[PDB]
Every structure is written in structure tokens, then in C-alpha cells.
Short mmCIF file of C-alpha atoms and ligand atoms in Angstrom, two decimals:
data_model
loop_
_atom_site.label_atom_id
_atom_site.label_comp_id
_atom_site.label_asym_id
_atom_site.label_seq_id
_atom_site.Cartn_x
_atom_site.Cartn_y
_atom_site.Cartn_z
CA UNK A 1 -7.21 13.34 22.17
CA UNK A 2 -7.01 11.28 18.99
CA UNK A 3 -5.90 14.40 17.12
CA UNK A 4 -3.09 15.01 19.61
CA UNK A 5 -2.03 11.37 19.25
CA UNK A 6 -1.91 11.65 15.46
CA UNK A 7 0.00 14.95 15.44
CA UNK A 8 2.56 13.39 17.79
CA UNK A 9 2.96 10.31 15.58
CA UNK A 10 5.69 9.79 13.00
CA UNK A 11 3.29 9.45 10.08
CA UNK A 12 1.82 12.93 9.63
CA UNK A 13 3.97 13.67 6.60
CA UNK A 14 3.66 12.33 3.06
CA UNK A 15 3.25 8.55 3.18
CA UNK A 16 5.25 6.32 0.85
CA UNK A 17 3.75 3.44 -1.11
CA UNK A 18 4.68 -0.14 -0.26
CA UNK A 19 5.11 -3.32 -2.31
CA UNK A 20 6.71 -6.77 -2.49
CA UNK B 1 -29.24 4.69 -17.60
CA UNK B 2 -27.64 7.65 -19.37
CA UNK B 3 -24.58 6.64 -17.34
CA UNK B 4 -24.46 3.29 -19.12
CA UNK B 5 -24.73 5.25 -22.37
CA UNK B 6 -21.79 7.42 -21.32
CA UNK B 7 -19.68 4.51 -20.06
CA UNK B 8 -20.38 2.58 -23.26
CA UNK B 9 -18.96 5.35 -25.45
CA UNK B 10 -16.14 5.91 -22.97
CA UNK B 11 -15.07 2.27 -23.23
CA UNK B 12 -15.02 2.39 -27.03
CA UNK B 13 -12.62 5.34 -26.91
CA UNK B 14 -10.45 3.68 -24.25
CA UNK B 15 -10.16 0.32 -26.01
CA UNK B 16 -8.86 1.85 -29.24
CA UNK B 17 -6.02 3.63 -27.44
CA UNK B 18 -5.47 0.63 -25.17
CA UNK B 19 -4.87 -1.68 -28.13
CA UNK B 20 -2.80 0.91 -30.00
CA UNK B 21 -0.89 3.01 -27.42
CA UNK B 22 0.94 6.18 -28.45
CA UNK B 23 4.73 6.15 -28.10
CA UNK B 24 7.65 8.56 -28.44
CA UNK B 25 5.60 11.75 -28.71
CA UNK B 26 8.33 14.16 -27.58
CA UNK B 27 12.00 14.63 -26.68
CA UNK B 28 13.81 15.78 -23.54
CA UNK B 29 15.54 18.72 -25.26
CA UNK B 30 12.08 20.16 -25.96
CA UNK B 31 11.61 20.96 -22.27
CA UNK B 32 13.22 23.38 -19.81
CA UNK B 33 13.98 22.11 -16.31
CA UNK B 34 12.72 24.44 -13.57
CA UNK B 35 12.19 22.78 -10.18
CA UNK B 36 11.68 19.39 -8.52
CA UNK B 37 8.11 18.99 -7.25
CA UNK B 38 8.59 15.60 -5.62
CA UNK B 39 10.87 12.59 -5.22
CA UNK B 40 10.55 8.92 -4.30
CA UNK B 41 12.22 5.53 -4.58
CA UNK B 42 11.43 5.91 -8.27
CA UNK B 43 11.54 8.42 -9.48
CA UNK B 44 11.15 12.19 -9.44
CA UNK B 45 8.67 14.77 -10.72
CA UNK B 46 9.85 18.13 -12.05
CA UNK B 47 8.17 21.31 -13.23
CA UNK B 48 9.19 21.84 -16.85
CA UNK B 49 8.50 24.41 -19.55
CA UNK B 50 7.68 23.32 -23.11
CA UNK B 51 9.51 25.88 -25.25
CA UNK B 52 7.34 25.24 -28.32
CA UNK B 53 4.14 26.31 -26.56
CA UNK B 54 5.39 28.00 -23.39
CA UNK B 55 3.18 25.62 -21.41
CA UNK B 56 4.21 24.31 -18.00
CA UNK B 57 4.06 20.57 -17.34
CA UNK B 58 4.83 18.04 -14.62
CA UNK B 59 7.48 15.65 -15.93
CA UNK B 60 8.21 12.38 -14.14
CA UNK B 61 11.65 10.89 -14.72
CA UNK B 62 12.05 7.18 -14.04
CA UNK B 63 15.50 5.58 -13.85
CA UNK B 64 15.08 2.37 -15.85
CA UNK B 65 17.79 0.59 -13.87
CA UNK B 66 16.09 1.55 -10.60
CA UNK B 67 12.71 0.39 -11.90
CA UNK B 68 14.21 -3.02 -12.67
CA UNK B 69 15.84 -3.34 -9.25
CA UNK B 70 12.50 -2.59 -7.58
CA UNK B 71 10.77 -5.11 -9.85
CA UNK B 72 8.35 -2.45 -11.10
CA UNK B 73 8.77 -3.06 -14.84
CA UNK B 74 5.26 -4.39 -15.47
CA UNK B 75 3.69 -1.81 -13.15
CA UNK B 76 5.47 0.98 -15.04
CA UNK B 77 4.22 -0.39 -18.36
CA UNK B 78 0.73 -0.58 -16.85
CA UNK B 79 0.86 3.06 -15.75
CA UNK B 80 1.91 4.47 -19.12
CA UNK B 81 -0.40 2.29 -21.22
CA UNK B 82 -3.38 3.16 -19.02
CA UNK B 83 -2.67 6.89 -18.71
CA UNK B 84 -2.42 7.39 -22.48
CA UNK B 85 -5.76 5.64 -22.96
CA UNK B 86 -7.98 7.19 -20.28
CA UNK B 87 -10.08 10.36 -20.46
CA UNK B 88 -11.97 11.85 -17.51
CA UNK B 89 -12.51 15.35 -16.04
CA UNK B 90 -10.89 14.35 -12.74
CA UNK B 91 -7.87 12.56 -14.21
CA UNK B 92 -4.65 14.39 -15.07
CA UNK B 93 -3.99 14.16 -18.80
CA UNK B 94 -0.82 12.60 -20.21
CA UNK B 95 0.47 15.01 -22.85
CA UNK B 96 3.73 13.34 -23.88
CA UNK B 97 5.77 10.22 -23.17
CA UNK B 98 9.23 9.14 -24.30
CA UNK B 99 12.48 7.46 -23.27
CA UNK B 100 16.24 7.65 -23.71
CA UNK B 101 19.27 5.53 -22.82
CA UNK B 102 18.76 5.87 -19.07
CA UNK B 103 15.29 7.18 -18.23
CA UNK B 104 11.57 6.95 -18.93
CA UNK B 105 9.63 10.20 -19.24
CA UNK B 106 5.97 11.06 -18.68
CA UNK B 107 4.76 14.61 -19.27
CA UNK B 108 1.40 15.58 -17.79
CA UNK B 109 -0.57 18.77 -17.16
CA UNK B 110 0.76 20.81 -14.26
CA UNK B 111 -1.51 21.63 -11.33
CA UNK B 112 -0.14 24.62 -9.35
CA UNK B 113 -2.86 24.17 -6.73
CA UNK B 114 -0.88 21.47 -4.95
CA UNK B 115 -1.83 18.23 -3.21
CA UNK B 116 -4.94 17.81 -1.08
CA UNK B 117 -2.57 16.37 1.51
CA UNK B 118 -0.87 19.73 2.04
CA UNK B 119 -4.13 21.66 2.40
CA UNK B 120 -5.73 19.00 4.60
CA UNK B 121 -2.82 18.88 7.04
CA UNK B 122 -2.57 22.67 7.33
CA UNK B 123 -6.30 23.36 7.71
CA UNK B 124 -6.65 20.34 9.99
CA UNK B 125 -9.84 18.82 8.59
CA UNK B 126 -12.56 19.49 6.02
CA UNK B 127 -16.21 20.10 6.85
CA UNK B 128 -18.53 17.30 5.75
CA UNK B 129 -19.88 19.34 2.81
CA UNK B 130 -16.26 20.07 1.85
CA UNK B 131 -15.28 16.40 2.08
CA UNK B 132 -18.48 15.40 0.28
CA UNK B 133 -17.51 17.60 -2.66
CA UNK B 134 -14.18 15.81 -3.09
CA UNK B 135 -15.63 12.37 -2.34
CA UNK B 136 -18.25 12.72 -5.08
CA UNK B 137 -15.54 13.27 -7.69
CA UNK B 138 -13.69 10.16 -6.54
CA UNK B 139 -16.90 8.13 -6.72
CA UNK B 140 -17.43 9.17 -10.34
CA UNK B 141 -13.77 8.57 -11.17
CA UNK B 142 -13.85 5.05 -9.74
CA UNK B 143 -17.10 4.36 -11.58
CA UNK B 144 -15.30 5.36 -14.77
CA UNK B 145 -12.08 3.44 -14.08
CA UNK B 146 -13.79 0.26 -12.88
CA UNK B 147 -16.06 0.18 -15.94
CA UNK B 148 -12.87 -0.08 -17.99
CA UNK B 149 -11.75 -3.01 -15.83
CA UNK B 150 -9.16 -0.75 -14.19
CA UNK B 151 -8.14 -0.96 -10.54
CA UNK B 152 -6.41 2.10 -9.08
CA UNK B 153 -4.91 0.81 -5.81
CA UNK B 154 -3.35 4.01 -4.43
CA UNK B 155 -6.06 6.42 -3.31
CA UNK B 156 -4.76 9.01 -0.84
CA UNK B 157 -4.60 12.81 -0.31
CA UNK B 158 -1.00 12.76 -1.58
CA UNK B 159 -2.23 11.64 -5.01
CA UNK B 160 -5.02 14.21 -5.32
CA UNK B 161 -4.26 17.65 -6.76
CA UNK B 162 -6.50 20.72 -6.57
CA UNK B 163 -6.90 22.67 -9.82
CA UNK B 164 -7.72 26.36 -10.33
CA UNK B 165 -11.44 25.57 -10.25
CA UNK B 166 -11.08 23.79 -6.91
CA UNK B 167 -11.74 20.37 -8.41
CA UNK B 168 -9.73 17.17 -7.94
CA UNK B 169 -7.05 15.86 -10.29
CA UNK B 170 -6.06 12.24 -9.65
CA UNK B 171 -2.37 11.44 -10.11
CA UNK B 172 0.00 8.47 -9.82
CA UNK B 173 -1.22 5.42 -11.74
CA UNK B 174 1.88 3.50 -10.65
CA UNK B 175 -0.19 0.60 -9.33
CA UNK B 176 -3.07 0.93 -11.81
CA UNK B 177 -3.87 -2.32 -13.61
CA UNK B 178 -6.41 -3.61 -16.11
CA UNK B 179 -7.77 -6.91 -14.81
CA UNK B 180 -11.15 -8.64 -15.07
CA UNK B 181 -10.45 -11.43 -12.60
CA UNK B 182 -8.82 -11.24 -9.18
CA UNK B 183 -5.26 -10.09 -8.49
CA UNK B 184 -2.68 -10.65 -5.75
CA UNK B 185 0.00 -7.93 -5.78
CA UNK B 186 0.88 -6.45 -2.40
CA UNK B 187 0.83 -2.72 -3.14
CA UNK B 188 -0.67 0.58 -2.02
CA UNK B 189 -0.26 2.69 1.11
CA UNK B 190 -0.42 1.15 4.63
CA UNK B 191 -3.16 3.42 6.00
CA UNK B 192 -5.33 2.74 2.95
CA UNK B 193 -4.82 -1.01 2.49
CA UNK B 194 -7.93 -3.19 2.56
CA UNK B 195 -7.94 -6.21 4.92
CA UNK B 196 -7.84 -8.69 2.02
CA UNK B 197 -4.65 -7.09 0.72
CA UNK B 198 -2.96 -7.32 4.11
CA UNK B 199 -4.07 -10.94 4.48
CA UNK B 200 -2.49 -11.84 1.13
CA UNK B 201 -5.80 -12.83 -0.47
CA UNK B 202 -6.95 -12.56 -4.07
CA UNK B 203 -8.69 -9.20 -4.26
CA UNK B 204 -10.61 -7.08 -6.76
CA UNK B 205 -11.87 -3.53 -7.31
CA UNK B 206 -13.51 -3.64 -3.87
CA UNK B 207 -10.17 -2.48 -2.46
CA UNK B 208 -10.67 0.90 -4.13
CA UNK B 209 -14.01 1.36 -2.37
CA UNK B 210 -12.39 0.50 0.96
CA UNK B 211 -9.76 3.14 0.21
CA UNK B 212 -12.56 5.63 -0.45
CA UNK B 213 -13.83 4.99 3.06
CA UNK B 214 -10.39 5.72 4.47
CA UNK B 215 -10.12 8.89 2.37
CA UNK B 216 -13.51 10.27 3.41
CA UNK B 217 -12.70 9.49 7.04
CA UNK B 218 -9.34 11.27 6.92
CA UNK B 219 -10.82 14.29 5.14
CA UNK B 220 -13.62 14.70 7.68
CA UNK B 221 -11.61 13.77 10.78
CA UNK B 222 -8.19 15.20 9.98
CA UNK B 223 -6.55 11.84 10.63
CA UNK B 224 -6.80 8.27 9.26
CA UNK B 225 -9.18 5.68 10.80
CA UNK B 226 -6.16 3.44 11.39
CA UNK B 227 -2.87 5.09 12.32
CA UNK B 228 0.28 4.26 14.27
CA UNK B 229 4.05 4.72 14.30
CA UNK B 230 4.73 1.55 12.31
CA UNK B 231 2.89 -0.08 9.36
CA UNK B 232 2.69 -3.41 11.21
CA UNK B 233 0.69 -1.74 13.99
CA UNK B 234 -1.57 -0.15 11.37
CA UNK B 235 -2.28 -3.52 9.75
CA UNK B 236 -3.32 -5.00 13.09
CA UNK B 237 -5.90 -2.23 13.50
CA UNK B 238 -7.21 -2.67 9.95
CA UNK B 239 -7.83 -6.41 10.33
CA UNK B 240 -9.29 -6.08 13.84
CA UNK B 241 -12.67 -5.18 12.35
CA UNK B 242 -13.13 -2.19 14.63
CA UNK B 243 -13.29 1.54 13.91
CA UNK B 244 -13.99 4.64 16.02
CA UNK B 245 -15.52 7.86 14.71
CA UNK B 246 -15.07 11.43 16.01
CA UNK B 247 -18.04 12.83 17.93
CA UNK B 248 -18.64 15.50 15.28
CA UNK B 249 -19.23 12.84 12.61
CA UNK B 250 -22.84 12.94 11.40
CA UNK B 251 -25.06 9.85 11.59
CA UNK B 252 -25.20 9.61 7.79
CA UNK B 253 -21.41 9.86 7.48
CA UNK B 254 -20.79 7.13 10.06
CA UNK B 255 -23.28 4.83 8.34
CA UNK B 256 -21.60 5.34 4.97
CA UNK B 257 -18.16 4.68 6.45
CA UNK B 258 -19.29 1.50 8.20
CA UNK B 259 -20.42 0.27 4.78
CA UNK B 260 -17.22 1.27 2.98
CA UNK B 261 -14.85 0.17 5.74
CA UNK B 262 -16.54 -3.23 5.72
CA UNK B 263 -14.29 -6.27 6.12
CA UNK B 264 -17.01 -8.54 4.73
CA UNK B 265 -16.82 -8.32 0.93
CA UNK B 266 -20.42 -9.52 0.64
CA UNK B 267 -21.51 -6.40 2.52
CA UNK B 268 -19.04 -3.71 1.40
CA UNK B 269 -20.62 -0.87 -0.57
CA UNK B 270 -19.52 -0.65 -4.20
CA UNK B 271 -19.08 -4.41 -4.43
CA UNK B 272 -22.73 -5.44 -4.12
CA UNK B 273 -25.45 -6.17 -6.69
CA UNK B 274 -26.37 -2.49 -7.04
CA UNK B 275 -22.72 -1.57 -7.52
CA UNK B 276 -21.74 2.08 -7.17
CA UNK B 277 -25.41 3.04 -6.86
CA UNK B 278 -25.39 1.90 -3.23
CA UNK B 279 -22.96 4.76 -2.64
CA UNK B 280 -24.42 7.38 -4.98
CA UNK B 281 -27.88 6.84 -3.47
CA UNK B 282 -26.71 6.93 0.15
CA UNK B 283 -28.24 9.58 2.42
CA UNK B 284 -24.87 11.30 2.87
CA UNK B 285 -24.88 12.10 -0.85
CA UNK B 286 -28.52 13.21 -0.85
CA UNK B 287 -27.64 16.81 -1.71
CA UNK B 288 -25.04 15.78 -4.30
CA UNK B 289 -25.88 16.59 -7.92
CA UNK B 290 -23.74 14.01 -9.72
CA UNK B 291 -24.30 15.49 -13.18
CA UNK B 292 -23.38 18.96 -11.93
CA UNK B 293 -20.22 17.55 -10.33
CA UNK B 294 -19.13 15.83 -13.55
CA UNK B 295 -19.90 18.97 -15.56
CA UNK B 296 -17.94 21.01 -13.01
CA UNK B 297 -20.89 23.36 -12.53
CA UNK B 298 -20.78 23.11 -8.73
CA UNK B 299 -19.03 25.89 -6.80
CA UNK B 300 -15.87 24.58 -5.13
CA UNK B 301 -15.53 25.04 -1.33
CA UNK B 302 -11.87 26.01 -1.72
CA UNK B 303 -9.78 27.67 -4.44
CA UNK B 304 -5.96 27.54 -4.25
CA UNK B 305 -4.06 30.84 -4.39
CA UNK B 306 -2.86 31.52 -7.94
CA UNK B 307 0.57 33.12 -8.34
CA UNK B 308 1.32 32.21 -11.95
CA UNK B 309 1.41 29.24 -14.36
CA UNK B 310 4.86 28.27 -13.09
CA UNK B 311 4.33 29.07 -9.42
CA UNK B 312 5.46 26.32 -7.04
CA UNK B 313 4.61 27.92 -3.69
CA UNK B 314 1.91 25.30 -3.08
CA UNK B 315 4.59 22.60 -3.25
CA UNK B 316 7.38 21.75 -0.80
CA UNK B 317 11.08 22.09 -1.61
CA UNK B 318 13.26 19.17 -2.71
CA UNK B 319 16.97 18.69 -3.38
CA UNK B 320 17.84 19.21 -7.05
CA UNK B 321 19.78 16.49 -8.87
CA UNK B 322 21.33 16.22 -12.34
CA UNK B 323 19.51 14.45 -15.17
CA UNK B 324 22.20 12.06 -16.39
CA UNK B 325 21.80 10.24 -19.70
CA UNK B 326 24.22 7.35 -20.26
CA UNK B 327 25.94 6.90 -23.62
CA UNK B 328 24.70 3.31 -23.59
CA UNK B 329 21.09 2.13 -23.74
CA UNK B 330 19.88 0.56 -20.50
CA UNK B 331 17.20 -2.12 -20.20
CA UNK B 332 16.19 -1.88 -23.86
CA UNK B 333 14.12 -5.06 -24.06
CA UNK B 334 12.43 -4.48 -20.70
CA UNK B 335 10.81 -1.20 -21.75
CA UNK B 336 10.50 -1.81 -25.50
CA UNK B 337 6.77 -1.04 -25.54
CA UNK B 338 7.11 2.15 -23.49
C1 LIG C 1 2.63 18.13 -9.44
C2 LIG C 1 1.89 17.48 -10.53
N1 LIG C 1 1.15 18.19 -11.43
N2 LIG C 1 0.55 17.41 -12.36
C3 LIG C 1 0.90 16.16 -12.06
C4 LIG C 1 0.57 14.97 -12.67
C5 LIG C 1 1.16 13.90 -12.03
C6 LIG C 1 1.98 13.93 -10.92
C7 LIG C 1 2.49 12.69 -10.42
C8 LIG C 1 2.24 12.31 -9.12
C9 LIG C 1 2.76 11.10 -8.71
O1 LIG C 1 2.54 10.64 -7.43
C10 LIG C 1 2.99 11.69 -6.61
C11 LIG C 1 3.09 11.17 -5.20
N3 LIG C 1 2.44 9.84 -5.16
C12 LIG C 1 4.54 10.91 -4.85
C13 LIG C 1 5.11 9.86 -5.70
C14 LIG C 1 4.75 8.54 -5.72
N4 LIG C 1 5.53 7.92 -6.65
C15 LIG C 1 6.39 8.80 -7.23
C16 LIG C 1 7.33 8.57 -8.21
C17 LIG C 1 8.04 9.68 -8.58
C18 LIG C 1 7.83 10.91 -8.02
C19 LIG C 1 6.88 11.13 -7.05
C20 LIG C 1 6.15 10.04 -6.65
C21 LIG C 1 3.49 10.32 -9.58
N5 LIG C 1 3.75 10.67 -10.84
C22 LIG C 1 3.24 11.85 -11.21
C23 LIG C 1 3.52 12.20 -12.57
C24 LIG C 1 4.01 13.40 -13.14
C25 LIG C 1 4.07 13.18 -14.50
O2 LIG C 1 3.65 11.91 -14.78
C26 LIG C 1 3.31 11.32 -13.60
C27 LIG C 1 2.33 15.11 -10.28
C28 LIG C 1 1.74 16.17 -10.92
#
């Protein structure tokens, strides 16, 4: 399932901002 | 049209503070360090106690030298100048701001409720009525910000706090900027970046409305519309022009999201002739009483557990670090106006 795929991903925690 | 009347008065108030920003309204020794509530490349947020009043605040400490290295001088000046000038029910208030030899300080109201991110991840996902409640507040907040020529550029559950009344408190104006034309800075969060940002194009406030689409999706689904292990993979999905919705998504919700997550700027909701009204009048917001939301008269779907003014249970733990203040002034000219 898509949920299972997300939970198994490495981006389920707090996501950092990006910039140049 | 009473909205135009409200926004008119709101802009008058904003412009006066914008042209004459408040500076040096407190000192570090007036606060008691308690606990770190969060940390990043720059800088860190701590729970502090103001001895004079006994009030608890969230104090962000920015290392001036680190800000310079990351080339975030102008962005930092943007954040402070904007925060001290804005005034809205769903925006965290800036109480004090000051600086010393080494650091910049911003003291804002503390929200023990914690981030939406934490609650969303734990619960899994919000019901559509639940997500609608939060979404409505963001819609009004963006209407307010955009009318002041302000672009936010960092919408995400991590930057949304839940107060004692169950309402949203927007935080982190690190990428906020006042601009009437287009802008070009690559900034934001991968999952929430609009296609035009990824493609290095000149973009406008339409990027905020795209972000709203991503937020609503994540709230209702429990996961972002575009996710992967690496940002590069996420960008590929964003620019592909395709999106898939969970089966439990209502017809109205999917229609709204297809209009917000629209690659074509000439078709994206919030950026058309009717402006924000295209969103506020959408079928998915049919039951939404916008005036009641603004007045905070609507009953919140969720109320965080209260354990005291200084309780930090709703926040994760972080490693504590000293607050060092050099004997020599650092980057004086760079942050003169702070
Ligand atoms: C916990 C809390 N209560 N009231 C608050 C008002 C603002 C902030 C706050 C949030 C923020 O973004 C937090 C999250 N994006 C993580 C993050 C991004 N950049 C950072 C830089 C330093 C530390 C954390 C982060 C950023 N700043 C604030 C804040 C607190 C006081 O003034 C601004 C936290 C508050």
C-alpha cells in the first residue's frame, strides 16, 4: 500500500528546509 | 466586500510597523533557559521563562556567523521585519527581539500544544472535516499575508502549531518575503515545492497555493502527494504533472486538489481572476463558515492535552547546548537593522 511505502521511507520524520 | 474593508485597515497597520520596525525590546538576562524545543542548521528554539511576568515564551537563537555562512542574512532580516509588523489570529506573535555580540534573538508566544506534524504522524491521518478545519485557517492566513504583498514559502505540518483552543498557529517566517513582482530564490521544503520553483523559474504567491494543496493532501491522506527517499526523486514526481489520490478521498476534495496542485499557472486556484474566492467558494468548503473560523467561534476537532504553561511533553527531546556570547561583536554591519 502507499501508506506502507511511506512508513518504510526515510522521510517520515521532520523535514528540513532547502536553499541555494 | 467587508473583507476588503478588513484588509484595507490591516494593511494600514502593517505598513506603519513595516516602515518603522521595533528593535532591541528586551535582553537575554531577562529570560530563564528551560529546554530546547527544536534545532536546525540555524538555529535553535528554546522554552524560556520571562522573570518579569512569569510568562513562558519560545526563543529562537540564531548564530550570526552561521547565518552569514549559509547566506541567510537578507532572509533573516526579512523574517524579523515581517514578524514584528504582522497581526493575525493564526500567526504567532513576536513579543521581543534583540541581539548581542554573537547571536540574534526572537521571542514569541509559546504553544504547548505542539506541531501538527507530531499529531498527524501519530494519528495517521485527519478526517476530511478535520483537515478542512485546519485548511480554512491557512486559506484566511494566506489571504491576509498575500494582501500585504507577503509570500510565505514554507507551508508544512512542521511549521503549524496547535493552541489550547485547537486552532492553528503559523511559525517560521524564515523564507517570508515582501515582494510585488516575481522572485527567484530556491527555498522551501522538497515535498511542498511548486514545479516553477524546481524548474528555476520566476515565481509568485501562487507557490503558496500549491503548497496548500500539498498540505491538504497530506492531512487527509496521512502522506504527501509526492514522496520518495531522496529529494531529486521527489522533484521528478512533482514536475511529471501526475498525482494519485487515496480511494477514501471525496469527489469534492479531489477536485479541489487537482486545482491547487495545478502545474499550469493560468489554471491554478488562488492565482486566477477571482483570486482566493475560487477556493473559498469551492464545494469542499461549502460547510465552512469563514467568519466563524476567523472569530474562532468554531469548535475544534482536536484539543491538545494541557499539562501546564511550561509543559513540553508535546515536543520531542533535543540535546542541550551552551549559549556562548563572545567578548567581541560579530557581523555588526550585516545585522545592523535587526
Ligand atoms: C515551539 C514554538 N512555540 N511558539 C513558537 C513560535 C515559533 C517557533 C519557531 C518555529 C520555527 O520553525 C520550526 C521548524 N521549522 C524547525 C525549524 C526551521 N528552522 C529553524 C531554525 C531554528 C530552529 C528550528 C527551526 C522557527 N522559528 C521559530 C521561532 C521561535 C521564536 O521565534 C521563531 C516555535 C514556536
